[PDB]
Amino acid sequence: GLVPRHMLDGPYQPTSFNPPVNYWMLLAPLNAGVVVEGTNNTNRWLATILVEPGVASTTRTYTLFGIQEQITVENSSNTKWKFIDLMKTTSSGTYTQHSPLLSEPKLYGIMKHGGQLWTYDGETPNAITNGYSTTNYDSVNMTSFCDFYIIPRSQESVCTEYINNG
Ligand code: NA
Ligand code: NA
Ligand code: NA
Ligand code: NA
Ligand code: NA
């Protein structure tokens, strides 16, 4: 009878799928670039990118939903990485930047719940969640470009702990 050293489901390999509602996808990207993207294919396209510390304003190219896109990015922090939520509202629309997370753990989260897509916002270790109203939130398809874990919404406090502390 030994004693084990929190409840984690994963890690899973990068993939495209229709995630279950009421679960966090805890994303663990290792390098700069696209982290996760998802759309309802009608009026909401969300892609989160990751920028390493110390990046002066520069135009970088990301494959967002299979399309080469030029995005001007910047990370004025010299110590933490920067996640940026990129949003468009049509299949060919232009992206705007939102709800960044400045991060030491380099972890991100997204969840389909209650009519919104929920992501994390702010600067670790003080990230909290906020949500984007998303038509047909429950049927959103997502692509993860990094290994990830699945956490039920009941364990959201644990997910938040991971976001904020690694
Ligand atoms: Na965010
Ligand atoms: Na994080
Ligand atoms: Na979900
Ligand atoms: Na809503
Ligand atoms: Na926390």
PDB file of C-alpha atoms in Angstrom, residues 15-111:
ATOM      1  CA  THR A  15      -5.524  16.554 -33.955  1.00  0.00           C
ATOM      2  CA  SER A  16      -8.657  18.072 -35.467  1.00  0.00           C
ATOM      3  CA  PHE A  17     -11.938  17.107 -33.848  1.00  0.00           C
ATOM      4  CA  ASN A  18     -15.250  18.213 -32.339  1.00  0.00           C
ATOM      5  CA  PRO A  19     -14.393  18.551 -28.631  1.00  0.00           C
ATOM      6  CA  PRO A  20     -17.042  17.653 -26.040  1.00  0.00           C
ATOM      7  CA  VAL A  21     -18.804  20.527 -24.339  1.00  0.00           C
ATOM      8  CA  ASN A  22     -18.024  21.079 -20.621  1.00  0.00           C
ATOM      9  CA  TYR A  23     -14.348  20.123 -20.892  1.00  0.00           C
ATOM     10  CA  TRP A  24     -11.194  22.200 -20.984  1.00  0.00           C
ATOM     11  CA  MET A  25      -8.550  21.405 -23.560  1.00  0.00           C
ATOM     12  CA  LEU A  26      -5.315  22.197 -21.728  1.00  0.00           C
ATOM     13  CA  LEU A  27      -2.771  22.953 -24.458  1.00  0.00           C
ATOM     14  CA  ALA A  28       0.988  22.577 -23.935  1.00  0.00           C
ATOM     15  CA  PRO A  29       2.774  24.242 -26.882  1.00  0.00           C
ATOM     16  CA  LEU A  30       6.562  24.170 -26.866  1.00  0.00           C
ATOM     17  CA  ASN A  31       7.473  26.683 -29.594  1.00  0.00           C
ATOM     18  CA  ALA A  32       6.085  29.906 -31.002  1.00  0.00           C
ATOM     19  CA  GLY A  33       3.342  29.595 -33.645  1.00  0.00           C
ATOM     20  CA  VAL A  34      -0.305  28.552 -33.807  1.00  0.00           C
ATOM     21  CA  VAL A  35      -1.557  26.757 -30.693  1.00  0.00           C
ATOM     22  CA  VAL A  36      -5.241  26.020 -31.269  1.00  0.00           C
ATOM     23  CA  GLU A  37      -7.947  27.128 -33.679  1.00  0.00           C
ATOM     24  CA  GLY A  38     -11.690  26.608 -33.897  1.00  0.00           C
ATOM     25  CA  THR A  39     -14.723  27.786 -35.832  1.00  0.00           C
ATOM     26  CA  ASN A  40     -18.478  27.387 -36.088  1.00  0.00           C
ATOM     27  CA  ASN A  41     -18.072  27.862 -39.887  1.00  0.00           C
ATOM     28  CA  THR A  42     -20.569  30.738 -39.919  1.00  0.00           C
ATOM     29  CA  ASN A  43     -19.623  33.842 -37.910  1.00  0.00           C
ATOM     30  CA  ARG A  44     -16.773  32.990 -35.513  1.00  0.00           C
ATOM     31  CA  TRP A  45     -13.195  31.887 -36.255  1.00  0.00           C
ATOM     32  CA  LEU A  46     -10.777  31.840 -33.312  1.00  0.00           C
ATOM     33  CA  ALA A  47      -7.065  31.013 -33.528  1.00  0.00           C
ATOM     34  CA  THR A  48      -4.615  31.425 -30.651  1.00  0.00           C
ATOM     35  CA  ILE A  49      -0.979  32.144 -31.484  1.00  0.00           C
ATOM     36  CA  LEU A  50       2.077  32.041 -29.210  1.00  0.00           C
ATOM     37  CA  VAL A  51       4.887  34.625 -29.335  1.00  0.00           C
ATOM     38  CA  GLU A  52       8.178  34.082 -27.502  1.00  0.00           C
ATOM     39  CA  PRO A  53       9.566  36.791 -25.193  1.00  0.00           C
ATOM     40  CA  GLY A  54      11.346  39.842 -26.523  1.00  0.00           C
ATOM     41  CA  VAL A  55       9.702  40.172 -29.940  1.00  0.00           C
ATOM     42  CA  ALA A  56       9.710  43.658 -31.427  1.00  0.00           C
ATOM     43  CA  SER A  57       6.839  44.532 -33.743  1.00  0.00           C
ATOM     44  CA  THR A  58       7.114  42.236 -36.747  1.00  0.00           C
ATOM     45  CA  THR A  59       4.873  40.651 -39.373  1.00  0.00           C
ATOM     46  CA  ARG A  60       4.836  36.851 -39.084  1.00  0.00           C
ATOM     47  CA  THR A  61       3.110  34.211 -41.192  1.00  0.00           C
ATOM     48  CA  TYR A  62       0.741  31.674 -39.631  1.00  0.00           C
ATOM     49  CA  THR A  63      -1.309  28.968 -41.312  1.00  0.00           C
ATOM     50  CA  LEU A  64      -4.753  29.787 -39.892  1.00  0.00           C
ATOM     51  CA  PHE A  65      -7.494  27.369 -40.954  1.00  0.00           C
ATOM     52  CA  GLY A  66      -5.213  26.174 -43.758  1.00  0.00           C
ATOM     53  CA  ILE A  67      -4.722  29.712 -45.108  1.00  0.00           C
ATOM     54  CA  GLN A  68      -1.447  31.598 -45.071  1.00  0.00           C
ATOM     55  CA  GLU A  69      -2.071  34.774 -43.018  1.00  0.00           C
ATOM     56  CA  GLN A  70       0.202  37.710 -42.211  1.00  0.00           C
ATOM     57  CA  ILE A  71      -0.185  39.006 -38.640  1.00  0.00           C
ATOM     58  CA  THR A  72       1.763  41.861 -37.042  1.00  0.00           C
ATOM     59  CA  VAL A  73       2.780  40.699 -33.544  1.00  0.00           C
ATOM     60  CA  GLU A  74       4.817  41.956 -30.613  1.00  0.00           C
ATOM     61  CA  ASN A  75       5.758  40.725 -27.140  1.00  0.00           C
ATOM     62  CA  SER A  76       7.229  43.540 -25.057  1.00  0.00           C
ATOM     63  CA  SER A  77       7.762  41.181 -22.104  1.00  0.00           C
ATOM     64  CA  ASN A  78      11.371  40.041 -21.764  1.00  0.00           C
ATOM     65  CA  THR A  79      10.516  37.117 -19.467  1.00  0.00           C
ATOM     66  CA  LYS A  80       7.084  35.720 -20.424  1.00  0.00           C
ATOM     67  CA  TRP A  81       5.519  34.317 -23.603  1.00  0.00           C
ATOM     68  CA  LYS A  82       2.373  35.876 -25.100  1.00  0.00           C
ATOM     69  CA  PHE A  83      -0.734  34.021 -26.282  1.00  0.00           C
ATOM     70  CA  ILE A  84      -3.001  36.110 -28.523  1.00  0.00           C
ATOM     71  CA  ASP A  85      -6.580  35.304 -29.496  1.00  0.00           C
ATOM     72  CA  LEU A  86      -7.030  36.064 -33.212  1.00  0.00           C
ATOM     73  CA  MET A  87     -10.630  36.490 -34.356  1.00  0.00           C
ATOM     74  CA  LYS A  88     -12.393  36.782 -37.694  1.00  0.00           C
ATOM     75  CA  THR A  89     -16.112  36.663 -38.447  1.00  0.00           C
ATOM     76  CA  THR A  90     -16.116  35.467 -42.083  1.00  0.00           C
ATOM     77  CA  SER A  91     -14.220  32.744 -43.909  1.00  0.00           C
ATOM     78  CA  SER A  92     -12.110  35.399 -45.672  1.00  0.00           C
ATOM     79  CA  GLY A  93     -12.247  38.157 -43.048  1.00  0.00           C
ATOM     80  CA  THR A  94      -9.290  39.871 -41.413  1.00  0.00           C
ATOM     81  CA  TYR A  95      -8.075  38.984 -37.935  1.00  0.00           C
ATOM     82  CA  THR A  96      -8.136  41.212 -34.876  1.00  0.00           C
ATOM     83  CA  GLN A  97      -6.232  40.597 -31.648  1.00  0.00           C
ATOM     84  CA  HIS A  98      -7.858  39.974 -28.281  1.00  0.00           C
ATOM     85  CA  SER A  99      -7.598  38.732 -24.720  1.00  0.00           C
ATOM     86  CA  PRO A 100      -3.853  38.040 -24.556  1.00  0.00           C
ATOM     87  CA  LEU A 101      -2.344  35.820 -21.863  1.00  0.00           C
ATOM     88  CA  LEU A 102       1.206  36.676 -20.788  1.00  0.00           C
ATOM     89  CA  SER A 103       2.565  33.376 -19.550  1.00  0.00           C
ATOM     90  CA  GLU A 104       5.507  31.667 -17.873  1.00  0.00           C
ATOM     91  CA  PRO A 105       4.048  28.100 -17.936  1.00  0.00           C
ATOM     92  CA  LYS A 106       3.313  28.319 -21.709  1.00  0.00           C
ATOM     93  CA  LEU A 107      -0.059  26.631 -21.138  1.00  0.00           C
ATOM     94  CA  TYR A 108      -3.409  27.624 -22.633  1.00  0.00           C
ATOM     95  CA  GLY A 109      -7.002  26.494 -22.348  1.00  0.00           C
ATOM     96  CA  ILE A 110     -10.145  26.546 -24.437  1.00  0.00           C
ATOM     97  CA  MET A 111     -13.611  25.182 -23.626  1.00  0.00           C
TER      98      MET A 111
END
